[PDB]
């Protein structure tokens, strides 16, 4: 249970972010330095645990991408989605450091490996509601 030293703001959690969804992020920072938050604010972190609560799936990933690993090199942060019931989802990290290309075999659902020169057509595909993929 560690949260950074801040003086309060006016752009935090809203009537949706506790009736629909919650976002949380946490890592291990063995140092304390000043940082910037996307809702605006220049504050200091603390040793080890660094827990933070937020509402968007953009502030969190911005912190994770640009701030932690590109500046502070910290790479042990969980990002957690939360349902209204209080239960949590673990989307990412799913590959350790989010490299997004390394694995020994990967998932397989859906494929389209075809060029565009032979495209779907209006008058040929009709009287139904399928999309540009099924040939």
Partner 1 sequence: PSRRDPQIGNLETPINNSSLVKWFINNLPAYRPGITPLRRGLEVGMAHGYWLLGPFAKLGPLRDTDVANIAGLLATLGMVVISTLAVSLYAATDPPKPVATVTVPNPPDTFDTTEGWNTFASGFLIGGVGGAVVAYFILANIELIQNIFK
Partner 2 sequence: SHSVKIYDTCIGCTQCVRACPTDVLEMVPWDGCKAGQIAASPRTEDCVGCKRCETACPTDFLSIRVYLSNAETTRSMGLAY
Binding site for partner 2 (CB under 8 A): 14-17, 20, 55-58, 61-62, 65, 91-92, 100-101, 105-116, 131-132
Residue among 27, 23, 19 nearest 3 (CA): 27
Beta strands in the chain (DSSP E): 22-29, 34-36, 42-44, 48-54, 78-82, 88-92
Task: Answer whether 36's CB lies under 8 Å from 42's CB.
Answer: yes
Q: Which of 22, 38, 46, 53 binds partner 1 (CB under 8 A)?
A: 53
Does 8 participate in binding partner 1 (rule CB under 8 A)?
yes
**Does an H or E element contain 60, and which?**
helix 59-62
Does 10 participate in binding partner 1 (rule CB under 8 A)?
yes
Q: Which is nearer to partner 1, 9 or 89 (CB)?
A: 9
End-to-end CA distance of the chain: 54
Does 84 participate in binding partner 1 (rule CB under 8 A)?
no
Does 52 participate in binding partner 1 (rule CB under 8 A)?
yes
Does 13 participate in binding partner 1 (rule CB under 8 A)?
yes
Q: Which is nearer to partner 1, 59 or 98 (CB)?
A: 59
The tally of CA atoms less than 13 A away on the side-chain side of residue 119 is 4
Q: Which is nearer to partner 1, 15 or 94 (CB)?
A: 15
Binding site for partner 1 (CB under 8 A): 3, 6-15, 19, 39, 52-53
């Amino acid at each position: 249970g560690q949260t950074p030293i801040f003086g309060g703001s006016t752009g935090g959690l809203l009537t949706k972010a506790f009736r629909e969804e919650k976002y949380v992020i946490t890592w291990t920072s063995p140092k304390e330095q000043v940082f910037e938050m996307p809702t605006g604010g220049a504050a200091i972190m603390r040793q080890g645990p660094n827990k933070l609560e937020l509402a968007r799936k953009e502030y969190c990933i911005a912190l994770g991408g640009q701030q932690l690993r590109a500046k502070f090199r910290i790479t042990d942060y969980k990002i957690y989605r939360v349902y209204p019931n209080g239960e949590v989802q673990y989307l990412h990290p799913s590959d350790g450091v989010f490299p997004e290309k390394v694995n020994e075999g990967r998932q397989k659902v859906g494929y389209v490996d075809r060029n565009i020169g032979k495209n779907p057509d209006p008058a040929k595909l009709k009287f139904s509601g399928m999309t540009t993929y099924n040939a």
